[PDB]
């Protein structure tokens, strides 16, 4: 009989909600009332990276804070030198319908994936001098949405099949599958400790996973629409999600429910990319209104705006040293901000 | 100058990459991109076979025009989370089977298959991304539709239909319904073809529709529109 399983699930959900309410004693707004306001944070387009002839959909900095990879529907992955506008490589993708790209922490490999249901690993440091296809990871039944490298041999991939995956590149096999989501998973961010990662799906739910264990620890539900972007706090004990309902929310793993709601009345367009700053005080969100809004994390106040894109800001990332912010968008242009 | 020797050669490599990117983009611009959409069986397999994983990219050349046909029927996910990737296609090839007026779905039998195709046509014709993207509507299963309408009535799918049960009027009624579902008549056109099994006439219709979209877009960039 399904009836008492449904009843037990309802009872468990009520108990979890009661525990969360008991944990929620003071809102983050109350604690951050006496802190110094961030002020007006104004950034200028320090460098515009031209060359793409399609919509940029994803990007990822290297660990050196200088190299930068970008994917667009021209079938081309371009690795840019951000300090001096320069493309070190131009990888011709097998499938032009790319929706995510990654840069390995070591810098040796670059990941790519999209509507081909394949995570393609590209080797940069080759003796031949050209970027080749190291491994073509297949097994997802849905389009790729976010690929992130644990190391040179492991990658975590989120697909639209409501499942996230972990892979072993040398064998090219599915070492672990992260199931539990209801809708299509749209984004994922590896924690700095690399043992945990959170993934956001279309079911308005953010989920926390253990890479080693393979089971969901905590599930977060505060949004009313699909989460398109997600990013860890630099501390690793918190993360932020951006959804199509034009609001960003900050969650904490220890408390396992929301801390702050980042929304403005004039903001109606959804969020396509969220990246924290190095210190975590500045939450950067790219919206569909052709703008990227800098948010203070501790106070839900708009520190600034990063306007300058003619179309929707699709990808947005922050350097590991915090010295730059890059906001590639659908107008085929990549802009570095400082 | 103030650029080192290897920095200069890196700039030279970047310039060569510029040249290759421009060449590839110029090659891509001259080649037409088409998105194939269908409901259920639809007839996508037949229409693809006539003109010779999540994306099935079928490429063919017809009259000095390279055609890219993208099939997205195997996605089986939320269409709204990836349909914006196809904003910019020249035309959408939409196929509805005219033999599905008297056929219901396996699940939710109260819903008809032609009604499912109409709901899909409303979804993608009035979609925010496909505002200026024309639709090359394909009406296949011609012989089966004629044979079925020889005995079955059109009223099963169209309770508000008043006409005979022959071919021409029923086909015209279906076509009129499908084009009348287009809310944004001032920015896009719906090209309708009753799928033929003779020669390359269907591919010719796609070629002429693509030629219209090309000329209309050229008028748009020229600002004459």
């Amino acid at each position, epitope marked *: 009989e399904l009836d008492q399983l449904r009843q037990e699930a309802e009872q468990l959900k009520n108990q979890i909600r009661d525990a969360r309410k008991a944990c929620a004693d003071a809102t983050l707004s109350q604690i951050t009332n006496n802190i110094d306001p961030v002020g007006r944070i104004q950034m200028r387009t320090r460098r515009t990276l031209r060359g793409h002839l399609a919509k940029i959909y994803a990007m990822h900095w290297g660990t050196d804070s*200088r*190299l930068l990879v970008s994917a667009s529907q021209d079938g081309k992955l371009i690795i840019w030198d951000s300090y001096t506008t320069n493309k*070190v490589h131009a990888i011709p993708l097998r499938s032009s319908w790319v929706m995510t790209c990654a840069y390995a922490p070591s810098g040796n490999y670059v990941a790519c994936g999209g509507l081909d249901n394949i995570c393609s690993i590209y080797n940069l440091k080759t*003796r031949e*001098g050209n970027v080749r296809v190291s491994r073509e990871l297949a097994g997802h039944t849905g389009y790729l949405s976010c690929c992130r490298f644990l190391d040179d041999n492991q990658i975590v991939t989120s697909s639209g099949d409501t499942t996230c995956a972990l892979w072993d590149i040398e064998t090219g096999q599915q070492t672990t599958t992260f199931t539990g989501h209801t809708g299509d998973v749209m984004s994922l961010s590896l924690a700095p400790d690399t043992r945990l990662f959170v993934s956001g799906a279309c079911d308005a739910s953010a989920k926390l996973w253990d890479v080693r264990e393979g089971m969901c620890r905590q599930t977060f539900t505060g949004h009313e629409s699909d989460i398109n972007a997600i990013c860890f706090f630099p501390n690793g004990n918190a993360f932020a999600t951006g959804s199509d309902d034009a609001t960003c929310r900050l969650f904490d793993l220890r408390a396992d429910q929301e801390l702050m709601t980042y929304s403005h009345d004039n903001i109606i367009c959804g969020i396509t990319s969220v990246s924290f700053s190095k210190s975590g005080r500045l939450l950067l969100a790219g919206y569909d209104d052709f703008n990227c809004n800098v948010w203070d994390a501790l106070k839900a106040d708009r520190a600034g705006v990063l306007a300058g894109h003619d179309n929707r800001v699709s990808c947005l990332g922050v350097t590991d040293d915090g010295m730059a912010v890059a906001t590639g968008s659908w107008d085929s242009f990549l802009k570095i901000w400082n | 100058c103030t650029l*080192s*020797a*290897e920095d200069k*050669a890196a700039v*030279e490599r970047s310039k060569m990459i510029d040249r290759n990117l421009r060449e590839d983009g110029e090659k891509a611009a001259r080649e037409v991109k088409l998105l194939l959409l269908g409901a259920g069986e639809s007839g996508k397999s037949t229409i693809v076979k006539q003109m010779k994983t999540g994306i099935v990219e079928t490429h063919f050349t017809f009259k000095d025009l390279h055609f890219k046909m993208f099939d997205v029927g195997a996605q089986r996910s939320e269409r709204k989370k990836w349909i914006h990737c196809f904003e910019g296609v020249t035309a959408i090839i939409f196929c509805v089977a005219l033999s599905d007026y008297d056929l219901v779905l396996a699940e939710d039998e109260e819903m008809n298959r032609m009604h499912e195709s109409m709901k899909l046509f409303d979804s993608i014709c009035n979609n925010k991304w496909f505002t200026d993207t024309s639709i090359i509507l394909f009406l296949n299963k011609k012989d089966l539709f004629e044979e079925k309408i020889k005995k079955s009535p059109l009223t099963i799918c169209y309770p508000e239909y008043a006409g005979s049960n022959t071919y021409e009027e029923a086909a015209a009624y279906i076509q009129c319904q499908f084009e009348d579902l287009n809310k944004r008549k001032d920015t896009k056109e719906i090209y309708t073809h009753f799928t033929c099994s003779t020669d390359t006439k269907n591919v010719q219709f796609v070629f002429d529709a693509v030629t219209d979209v090309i000329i209309k877009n050229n008028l748009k960039d020229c600002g004459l529109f």
Partner: single-chain antibody
Amino acid sequence: VQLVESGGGLVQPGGSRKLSCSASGFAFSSFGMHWVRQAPEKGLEWVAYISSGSGTIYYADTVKGRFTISRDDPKNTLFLQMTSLRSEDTAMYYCVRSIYYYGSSPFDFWGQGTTLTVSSSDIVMTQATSSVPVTPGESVSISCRSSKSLLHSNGNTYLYWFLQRPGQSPQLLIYRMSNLASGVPDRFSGSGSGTAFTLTISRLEAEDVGVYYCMQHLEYPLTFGAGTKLEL
């Protein structure tokens, strides 16, 4: 990867000869080519350079006008046309590949070389050590001094280290004074300040015996060193 070179041999003074460098195993079109001499008992001397796409061509002072360098990218071959040869050109010409981007490792591969025999303002780098007796397992600090500072405003110092085992083509060890080349063991490490540079071997092996060369890559009239030679 392989860079096999053809041509060479006896040539009468004032004659002409064509040196062909056959390339196989790597993307030749994207690699900038180089030519380096070595007299029968002297150091290395740079000759020419052709870039990717033949956009930029540089020769040496002793080479300009007489020699011309060209590449056939579809055929994956390199040419060094020679005119009005002289006795100073009696050297083994090496074919050198060099790709140029951020993080690249220029001068990765050196060809075996062809012996060409002719019958009868720039930076200067010195290695005063010359020969040195050595024992395995010890530490050696091969030093090289540049006339002018090799540190650029971009933070990249442009010193390179090369190893030439007896009867073998030169091999890249350290590029940009610090970066260990691919395949070189970790025993090699370089350091310097812009004027003086030292290359250190933590432990010596029997495979390390050879002649070490230091090269500059700041101004294109490339200058090598005399060559510190290690003897057991």
